[PDB]
Design a protein around this ligand. Structure first.
Ligand SMILES: [K+]
Ligand SMILES: [K+]
Ligand SMILES: [K+]
Ligand SMILES: [Mg+2]
Ligand SMILES: [Mg+2]
Ligand SMILES: [Mg+2]
Ligand SMILES: [Mg+2]
Ligand SMILES: [Mg+2]
Ligand SMILES: [Mg+2]
Ligand SMILES: [Mg+2]
Ligand SMILES: [Mg+2]
Ligand SMILES: [Mg+2]
Ligand SMILES: [Mg+2]
Ligand SMILES: [Mg+2]
Ligand SMILES: [Mg+2]
Ligand SMILES: [Mg+2]
Ligand SMILES: [Mg+2]
Lengths: 154, 31, 198, 53, 235, 35, 53
RNA sequence: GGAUUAAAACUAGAGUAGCGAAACGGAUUCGAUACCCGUGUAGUUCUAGUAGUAAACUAUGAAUACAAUUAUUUAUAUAUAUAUAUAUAAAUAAUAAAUGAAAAUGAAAGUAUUCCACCUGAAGAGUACGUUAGCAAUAAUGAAACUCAAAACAAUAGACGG
């Protein structure tokens, strides 16, 4: 769901403004892939599976009995009195989805505004979804993949 | 809009009502 | 004009399901609050029998005259008579009867067919209220929304299980047109189907 | 990441779940039925004070 | 090749051998920068008049067949429209039979109640004669009649107790058996899992081959399937 | 006390023991013990 | 030493409750996020306080 | 699209104490077609309808996810050394952050998402014409020409206030 992803993007911005060290997001494949990309890129300190009440200390298998109570817990980073994850916005919106070929993704990473999408800025992360997998735009260009431009994180 | 500005619309509405009453009267005599 | 004009609120007149449930509520010895006379007669006889047995174990004011025990039964059956209780109790019994005629299994209360049947009972009761309270617009609005809610649940059923859908609407006295077509229960409907009569 | 997101209930787990859920519904129905009979008994004890003739 | 479209039949039975099919195509709207779906209804030739409203069909371009017909039905991808027609006819017959049976069960119940209202005899009085005749020795013909009103040929203290039995009593025992089974299944599996040695033996005894070489989930399900096959099949 | 109660206004325990052959299977048991 | 942030799953409550019913599904409280409890200063309690009073 | 919709008004049949457009009088006044006083008709009331308009206002469309505190009630639940205590929601008040032209908003007028309605200088104008609906009053829809470089909001310091 792009709506759920929009909710998570706004939630992370709200948490950064108040500078909470730990927060939770919905437990879904897309959310987990989204969070994992942020973790590998250094935007998130930690990524743990858990419940509504907090991160799990020991592995708890997820089943239909507890799926409704599952959450993903992420740790936010702050350095030099500044949040590492300052902004998080969707590019492809629920009511206007944007699919780009690899050629247009290369233009976006080169400073060209494609379909009103402002080009990639220094130190910014743009994520792309292709065949239900989320990857960095630079990685999609390396794999010659065409996909939906989901969001941009800075 | 403020009361001051409302008063301009009030005057226009009053004059339209006054003119329609006047027209009605004429129709009665001319009818 | 040859179209099958089925009242979207009350359905076809003389629907066997609607008529039979109504008749069941008006049977001579129907009781309210979940009691059935057969279970109440055995239970009251058991109390007397049980008391005698308890008086033949630790025992050695005689027994009550049978006429007095018959009057205690008459008081219990008058207090629990459906004909002496609120109309809401009768509707509660109808909802149970309707649910059991449509349920897929014991305990099925959320299937679309069961929901539609339970809504039908309340729609029928609410429509009767409106016919006697034609100026009660607050409850007319409730009726409209309830009728539209029944349409929504049945429309989903048609998508999910078409075979059950056609069976359900036939038993409830409705037709596909009554469900699919937009309905506002407006003033033209009240005059074309003579909701209030004359 | 390699862990599956959801593990479907095994057929046996679904059987035990249905047993518990059926029991829960049956117990509540029984307890309400017995409560009603206990109120019918307490009403019989006082029906000698009620007038029908 | 001939241009083929996919669409939903939205009108049928109004024109002879003609149906209206709704085709939706994907287009880009430059103004709003969004890829939209554009809809159009096509008049389509149905040579066999097989299609029905609601069906999903593929239409293929053909020669001009009329002023406005330039496509024909080429295949029924999904036949939901045809299914609707079949289920409606069956419903009328199926419901009529059920309503007839229910109408006959209602009149029968009414007759039984009416018949009982014609018998002034009451359970309490009848149970007060079977308990006085059984304590006094008198055997008026009423008892023989009572032995027919209820079918109780023998008049003993253990016959009035079986005339006044309430269903609630049976429910109370079925509920205890249900609770026992669940409790036993859980305790059994709980204990088995606590002792890996008794678990490995348990599986082998019930016919598992080398249960030792199994996963926690691949083997706990076997234990659960066995514990529920040793407390529900034997009972 | 339940079934074996002395209250004039008893509970359903007494009626349940009657129909369950308990107030009778205990009366005989007590009497047999007295024997 | 009470643990904060731990949710008892239905799998951990196999036995019936004080009402005689089994728990087969999460309740509404279990489905509300409890992040706030992680950040609220814990109320310190002591058994000795009860004896002192 | 449909339904409901204050007050006034209208169509019939009742009712009519008090109040009270209008009208006729008494005062006040330079004058008083007013403010005050009297007599007081419609109306205000009921029954059956028409009509669908209000500063019909929170001048703030609905829905969902989310974000830092306090206080005060309310509800549910829990506990006991039995009346408090501990929890979880709702409401209200004051706020942090954020937002904003500011006044301020404060769980939205914040961070986001989805859908609908609406706006594009003033005046002309919610007017003219046409159309639709209504017994009617009217209601809805709704322009252009000419003219002008205006027009408007928040806030600031004054001046003034019967
Ligand atoms: K032709
Ligand atoms: K009057
Ligand atoms: K709206
Ligand atoms: Mg304005
Ligand atoms: Mg709905
Ligand atoms: Mg008022
Ligand atoms: Mg009149
Ligand atoms: Mg005058
Ligand atoms: Mg004068
Ligand atoms: Mg006056
Ligand atoms: Mg009206
Ligand atoms: Mg007006
Ligand atoms: Mg208006
Ligand atoms: Mg108001
Ligand atoms: Mg709603
Ligand atoms: Mg107008
Ligand atoms: Mg100002």
């Amino acid at each position: 769901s792009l709506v759920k992803l929009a909710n998570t993007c706004a939630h992370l911005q709200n948490c950064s403004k108040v500078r909470v060290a730990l927060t939770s997001i919905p437990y879904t494949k897309l959310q987990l892939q989204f969070a994992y990309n942020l973790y590998q890129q250094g935007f998130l300190s930690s990524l743990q599976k858990g419940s509504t009440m907090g991160p799990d200390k020991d592995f708890v298998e997820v089943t239909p009995d507890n799926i409704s109570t599952r959450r993903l817990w992420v740790g936010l980073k702050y350095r030099d009195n500044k949040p590492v994850l300052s902004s998080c916005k969707l590019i492809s919106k629920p009511n206007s989805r944007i699919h780009l070929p690899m050629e247009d993704m290369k233009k976006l990473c080169s400073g060209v505004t494609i379909r009103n999408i402002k080009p990639l800025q220094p130190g910014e992360l743009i994520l792309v979804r292709a065949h239900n997998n989320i990857m960095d735009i630079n990685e999609a260009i390396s794999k010659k993949l065409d996909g939906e431009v989901l969001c941009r994180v800075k | 809009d403020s009361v001051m500005r409302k008063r301009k619309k009030k005057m226009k509405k009053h004059k339209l009502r006054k003119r329609r009453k006047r027209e009605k009267a004429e129709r009665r005599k001319l009818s | 004009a040859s179209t099958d004009k089925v009242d979207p609120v009350l359905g076809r007149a003389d629907t066997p399901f609607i008529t039979r449930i109504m008749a069941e509520l008006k049977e001579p010895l129907v009781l309210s609050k979940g009691y059935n006379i057969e279970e109440v007669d055995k239970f009251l006889a058991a109390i007397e029998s049980a008391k005698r047995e308890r008086a033949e174990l630790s025992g050695l004011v005689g027994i009550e005259d049978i006429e007095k025990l018959e009057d205690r039964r008459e008081a219990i059956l008058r207090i629990l008579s459906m004909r002496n209780s609120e109309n809401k109790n009768a509707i509660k019994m109808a909802v149970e009867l309707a649910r059991k005629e449509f349920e897929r299994f014991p305990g099925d209360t959320g299937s679309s067919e069961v929901q539609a049947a339970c809504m039908t009972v309340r729609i029928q009761n609410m429509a009767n209220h409106i016919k006697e309270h034609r100026k009660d617009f607050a409850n007319t609005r409730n009726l409209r929304i309830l009728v539209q809610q029944r349409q929504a649940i049945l429309r989903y059923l048609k998508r999910d299980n078409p075979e059950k859908y056609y069976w359900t609407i036939q038993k409830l006295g409705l037709n596909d047109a009554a469900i699919t077509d937009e309905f506002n229960m407006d003033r033209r409907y009240m005059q074309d189907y003579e909701f209030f009569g004359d | 990441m390699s862990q599956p997101l959801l593990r479907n209930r095994s057929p046996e787990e679904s059987e035990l779940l249905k047993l518990k859920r059926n029991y829960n519904r049956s117990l509540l129905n029984f307890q309400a039925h017995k409560k009603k009979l206990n109120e019918l008994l307490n009403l019989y004890h006082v029906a000698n004070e009620f007038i029908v003739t | 090749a001939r241009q083929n479209f996919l669409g939903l039949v939205v009108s049928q039975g109004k024109m002879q051998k003609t149906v209206k099919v709704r085709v939706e195509t994907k287009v880009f709207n430059k103004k709003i920068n969004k890829e939209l779906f554009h809809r159009r209804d096509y008049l389509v030739h149905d040579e066999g008049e097989i299609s029905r409203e609601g069906d999903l069909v593929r239409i293929e371009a053909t020669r001009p067949l009329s002023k406005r017909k330039f496509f024909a039905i080429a295949e029924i991808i999904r036949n939901k429209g045809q299914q609707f027609a079949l289920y409606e006819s069956e419903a009328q017959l199926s419901v009529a039979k059920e309503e007839a049976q229910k109408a006959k069960e209602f009149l029968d119940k009414r007759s039984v109640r009416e018949n009982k209202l014609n018998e002034k005899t009451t359970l309490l009085r009848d149970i007060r004669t079977i308990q006085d005749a059984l304590s006094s020795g008198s055997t008026p013909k009423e008892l023989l009649e009572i032995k027919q009103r209820y079918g109780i040929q023998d008049f003993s203290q253990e016959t009035v107790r079986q005339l006044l039995q309430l269903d609630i009593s049976g429910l109370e025992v079925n509920l205890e058996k249900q609770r026992s089974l669940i409790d036993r299944i859980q305790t059994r599996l709980s204990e088995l899992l606590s002792n890996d040695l008794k678990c490995d033996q348990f599986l082998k005894d019930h016919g598992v081959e080398d249960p030792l070489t199994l996963k926690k989930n691949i083997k706990k399900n076997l234990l659960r399937k066995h514990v529920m096959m040793d407390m529900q099949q034997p009972s | 006390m339940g079934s074996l109660s002395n209250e004039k206004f008893f509970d359903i325990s007494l009626v349940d023991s009657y129909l369950n052959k308990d107030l009778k299977n205990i009366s005989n048991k007590i009497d047999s013990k007295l024997n | 030493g009470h643990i904060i942030g731990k949710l008892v799953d239905v799998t951990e409550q196999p036995h019936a409750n004080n009402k005689g019913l089994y728990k087969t599904r999460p309740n509404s409280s279990d489905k509300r996020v409890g992040v706030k409890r992680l950040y609220r200063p814990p109320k310190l309690t002591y058994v000795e306080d009860r004896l002192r009073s």
